[PDB]
Amino acid sequence: PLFEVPGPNSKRANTHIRDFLQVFIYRLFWKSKDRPRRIRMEDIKKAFPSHSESSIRKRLKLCADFKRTGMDSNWWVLKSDFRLPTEEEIRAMVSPEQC
């Protein structure tokens, strides 16, 4: 082996889960066709059932603003002053070897 496998609940392992969540959130904004871009909490929780919503609230507070709507299905609208990172910048965040 040439690449190090982390231990359970290590600092490297916990950083990887956070960054992979940050990668997946960003690509959901790139998939959204609405102007301004918007995503749902339900789509992240369906892909990440082992995360609490509060841990997802940490990754969404810096890049998105919560707009509540009169239905049990609400949107995270991308901040107008937040520049969404480009594709190759997302590529540098998490490599296939780290996964």
Add this chain to the structure above:
DNA sequence: AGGGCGCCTATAAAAGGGGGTGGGGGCGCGTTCGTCCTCAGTCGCGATCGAACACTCGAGCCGAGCAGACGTGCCTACGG
């Protein structure tokens, strides 16, 4: 040239010194042994240095609670 004479052989004893020869003792020298010194190596003791562990502080993360906002249902008051 040859008879008689001188000398050799043998026997005792002494006396004294001199010379010759063999053995022993004494002296001087060299050799051998013992002791001491020096060098090397090893072990023991002390001191110093490095490593490992434990304690403390701080930072980060997660959970829970409360507040705000909107839906929905119910009750009341207002308007037709």
